[PDB]
Enzyme design. Structure first.
Site, PDB file in Angstrom:
ATOM      1  N   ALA A  12       3.292   8.107 -22.819  1.00 53.61           N
ATOM      2  CA  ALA A  12       3.891   7.205 -23.720  1.00 53.61           C
ATOM      3  C   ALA A  12       4.752   6.812 -22.504  1.00 53.61           C
ATOM      4  O   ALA A  12       6.264   7.549 -22.393  1.00 53.61           O
ATOM      5  CB  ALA A  12       4.133   8.006 -25.109  1.00 53.61           C
ATOM      6  N   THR A 220      -6.615   2.070  -0.076  1.00 60.80           N
ATOM      7  CA  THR A 220      -5.666   0.848  -0.425  1.00 60.80           C
ATOM      8  C   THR A 220      -4.459   1.128   0.715  1.00 60.80           C
ATOM      9  O   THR A 220      -3.722   2.053   1.638  1.00 60.80           O
ATOM     10  CB  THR A 220      -4.898   1.276  -2.211  1.00 60.80           C
ATOM     11  OG1 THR A 220      -4.399   2.508  -2.389  1.00 60.80           O
ATOM     12  CG2 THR A 220      -6.287   0.727  -2.888  1.00 60.80           C
ATOM     13  N   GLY A 222      -1.537  -0.891   0.822  1.00 54.44           N
ATOM     14  CA  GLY A 222      -0.617  -1.914   0.156  1.00 54.44           C
ATOM     15  C   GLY A 222      -1.344  -3.400   0.499  1.00 54.44           C
ATOM     16  O   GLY A 222      -2.235  -3.711   0.153  1.00 54.44           O
ATOM     17  N   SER A 223       0.398  -4.243   0.851  1.00 54.64           N
ATOM     18  CA  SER A 223      -0.196  -5.396   1.255  1.00 54.64           C
ATOM     19  C   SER A 223      -1.371  -5.828   1.724  1.00 54.64           C
ATOM     20  O   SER A 223      -1.752  -6.498   1.761  1.00 54.64           O
ATOM     21  CB  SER A 223       0.760  -6.043   1.933  1.00 54.64           C
ATOM     22  OG  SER A 223       0.691  -5.576   3.014  1.00 54.64           O
ATOM     23  N   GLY A 225      -3.956  -5.490   1.984  1.00 53.07           N
ATOM     24  CA  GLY A 225      -5.674  -4.876   1.031  1.00 53.07           C
ATOM     25  C   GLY A 225      -6.446  -3.529   0.576  1.00 53.07           C
ATOM     26  O   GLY A 225      -5.594  -2.584   0.949  1.00 53.07           O
ATOM     27  N   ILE A 248       3.220  -1.212 -11.683  1.00 51.42           N
ATOM     28  CA  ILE A 248       3.375  -0.586 -11.725  1.00 51.42           C
ATOM     29  C   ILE A 248       1.538  -0.274 -12.852  1.00 51.42           C
ATOM     30  O   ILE A 248       0.903  -1.405 -13.269  1.00 51.42           O
ATOM     31  CB  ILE A 248       4.028  -0.017 -13.038  1.00 51.42           C
ATOM     32  CG1 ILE A 248       3.266   1.994 -13.569  1.00 51.42           C
ATOM     33  CG2 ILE A 248       3.866  -0.697 -14.272  1.00 51.42           C
ATOM     34  CD1 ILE A 248       4.455   1.916 -15.140  1.00 51.42           C
ATOM     35  N   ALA A 249       0.892   1.162 -12.262  1.00 49.77           N
ATOM     36  CA  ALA A 249      -0.606   0.497 -12.849  1.00 49.77           C
ATOM     37  C   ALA A 249      -1.777  -0.377 -12.285  1.00 49.77           C
ATOM     38  O   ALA A 249      -2.659  -0.139 -12.680  1.00 49.77           O
ATOM     39  CB  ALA A 249      -0.702   0.067 -14.559  1.00 49.77           C
ATOM     40  N   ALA A 250      -1.023  -0.500 -11.096  1.00 50.75           N
ATOM     41  CA  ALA A 250      -2.232  -1.990 -10.077  1.00 50.75           C
ATOM     42  C   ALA A 250      -2.885  -1.148  -9.937  1.00 50.75           C
ATOM     43  O   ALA A 250      -4.814  -1.814  -9.645  1.00 50.75           O
ATOM     44  CB  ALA A 250      -1.136  -2.380  -9.611  1.00 50.75           C
ATOM     45  N   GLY A 251      -2.782   0.301  -9.099  1.00 54.64           N
ATOM     46  CA  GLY A 251      -3.679   0.714  -8.891  1.00 54.64           C
ATOM     47  C   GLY A 251      -4.990   1.533  -9.687  1.00 54.64           C
ATOM     48  O   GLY A 251      -6.667   1.724  -9.432  1.00 54.64           O
ATOM     49  N   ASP A 252      -4.395   1.732 -11.152  1.00 54.14           N
ATOM     50  CA  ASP A 252      -5.013   1.964 -12.110  1.00 54.14           C
ATOM     51  C   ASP A 252      -6.244   1.015 -12.414  1.00 54.14           C
ATOM     52  O   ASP A 252      -7.651   1.505 -12.963  1.00 54.14           O
ATOM     53  CB  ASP A 252      -4.602   2.811 -13.245  1.00 54.14           C
ATOM     54  CG  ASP A 252      -3.601   4.381 -13.049  1.00 54.14           C
ATOM     55  OD1 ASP A 252      -4.465   4.447 -11.864  1.00 54.14           O
ATOM     56  OD2 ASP A 252      -2.241   3.687 -13.148  1.00 54.14           O
ATOM     57  N   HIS A 276     -10.245  -6.263  -7.439  1.00 55.21           N
ATOM     58  CA  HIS A 276      -8.595  -7.202  -6.472  1.00 55.21           C
ATOM     59  C   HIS A 276      -8.056  -7.868  -8.056  1.00 55.21           C
ATOM     60  O   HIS A 276      -6.630  -8.643  -7.784  1.00 55.21           O
ATOM     61  CB  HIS A 276      -9.005  -7.528  -5.305  1.00 55.21           C
ATOM     62  CG  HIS A 276      -9.369  -6.360  -4.183  1.00 55.21           C
ATOM     63  ND1 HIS A 276      -9.466  -6.665  -2.941  1.00 55.21           N
ATOM     64  CD2 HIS A 276      -8.075  -5.284  -3.841  1.00 55.21           C
ATOM     65  CE1 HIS A 276      -8.506  -6.031  -1.776  1.00 55.21           C
ATOM     66  NE2 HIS A 276      -8.243  -5.134  -3.057  1.00 55.21           N
TER      67      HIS A 276
END
Lengths: 305, 305
Positions: A12, A220, A222-223, A225, A248-252, A276
């Site tokens: 949470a 990954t 980073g910028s 790709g 946040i959660a971009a990678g997930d 992507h």
């Protein structure tokens, strides 16, 4: 599309935007507050469910109100929550997050019920893991449970996908059971012992993982790709250009959408473009799960591309 | 014992113990988690109710689940929650707290529903404020509402007690309406412009407040106790020696217990000993409100003294 089984954490997320990170002994008043369901396990389970996968989720919440709410929520995110256990006497996992006026953030985590996802619980899911097409896991669950789940999968033609986050070294016994690994640069180094700053390093680190027997390696970067490498043959695949508001959660999201695409039997190159697209959308929204885009949005984004 | 009216904030405290405060961009996993009802307004309302006062509480919670729970709780803490409003479309106040392995802490606050306690709401409580014997307030509520509440009190023989926390300068118009003020050293300086390190400074700062027309001035000095001053005549009153485990709410307990004692018409010296006993107990327990001692415990502590 084969069935997907995600095994991981549920949090949470309590997010507070504030001027500056309080110094020791200081109290600061924030300007914006948001409670959003998070946790790598759930973020990825939601990213996959929303993107269109046939996914079941093995996880643990506590016996508190928040635990019931997230459970209520995940059920509407196109996820089979039958495998989500409720642990008596324990709190649902939580993440306390500060975001300063400079856009930076710091996260404090309470494992809670997540630390209760045991090997015994995994064994109870032997059949579910056996009948799935793929298993997606992270590292916010006891390593022994991830280990045991990977073995069952290896034994029953279940593809093992691992997002090695948060960073930490892993035994060759587990790596020798992984089919798809998605580490970022920090994690790649932590796993191979090779610092990854450039594409030459990434290829080298990838090579190390391939020798562990992992067929598909996506680092990954980073910028710039991701370094997509299949059995020693890799290349940099650029992501989309977007104005990030909250990463946040971009990678997930990337991980959840990616597996959906692969289980849909799309070729890797297209699968990566799909993941992507989903991540690009995710960074333009606030909160973990509240920002995870649904299939329709992902395809619309792609079509306008 | 005359009736007490507390006007102030209500927070849901999320406390996470961790090894070290995460640096910018870092994520850390804690070792212990606790959700406890907090907020200076409520902490003081509870400290007073439990210590035996006849107290009513003017405050605001949001329309969320947490808001309902705290409300459910405060009702059992011997507090009349009839004056606690529920604000539609708003979140209940929250405090995110980190405590490192060195015992230090940092607090991040979301005002939430607390920022909605307006002058209009105070006016709606004109009679309640008028009929009370004393009004106890802090500074986590809109200054205009504290201001308006103090005027009504000044107009109807209602003693005005102010815990000037968190630190900030205040207009002479409000100070000229205060009967009992309980600033710590930082707050005393912020209010008078006089740095307070020693008892000589405290007396000087006290003098400044007395000239504002405040009859009773109690400056908490930290370890050495409190500088108790009535109309220019002061002295240092030592507190009890105890092993602190968590000092949060220590000052609020002191304030709540103190007013209970005074409204019970006990002489200042005894009143201060009562408040000190309550605070001494409070620092040996974790969480804000969960650590506030009840009357029986306070008297038992004193009797064994």
């Amino acid at each position: 599309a084969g069935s997907l089984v995600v095994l991981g954490s549920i949090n949470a997320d309590h997010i507070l935007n504030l001027q500056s990170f309080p110094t020791p002994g200081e109290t600061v008043t924030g300007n914006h507050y948001q409670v959003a369901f998070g946790g790598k396990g759930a973020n990825q389970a939601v990213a996959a469910g929303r993107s269109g996968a046939n996914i079941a989720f093995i996880a643990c919440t506590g016996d508190d109100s928040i635990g019931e709410s997230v459970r209520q929520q995940l059920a509407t995110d196109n996820i089979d929550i039958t495998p989500v256990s409720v642990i008596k006497g324990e709190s649902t996992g939580v993440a306390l997050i500060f975001v300063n006026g400079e856009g930076e953030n710091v996260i404090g985590i309470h494992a809670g019920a997540n630390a209760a996802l045991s090997p015994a619980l995994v064994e109870a899911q032997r059949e579910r893991i056996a009948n799935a097409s793929a298993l997606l896991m992270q590292l916010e669950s006891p390593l022994e449970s991830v280990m045991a789940a990977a073995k069952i999968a290896h034994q029953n033609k279940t593809i093992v996908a691992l997002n090695p986050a948060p960073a930490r070294e892993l035994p060759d016994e587990l790596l020798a059971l992984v089919d798809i690994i998605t580490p970022n640069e920090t994690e790649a180094e932590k796993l191979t012992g090779i610092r990854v700053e450039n594409d030459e390093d990434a290829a080298k680190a990838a090579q190390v993982l391939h020798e562990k027997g992992i067929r598909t390696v996506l680092i990954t970067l980073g910028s710039r790709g991701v370094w997509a490498s299949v059995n020693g043959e890799g290349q940099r695949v650029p992501g989309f250009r977007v104005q990030a508001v909250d990463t946040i959660a971009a990678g997930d999201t990337f991980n959840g959408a990616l597996i959906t695409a692969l289980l849909e039997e799309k070729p890797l190159p297209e699968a990566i473009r799909f993941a992507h697209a989903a991540a690009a959308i995710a960074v333009t929204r606030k909160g973990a799960q509240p920002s995870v885009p649904w299939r329709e949005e992902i395809d619309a984004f792609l079509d306008r591309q």
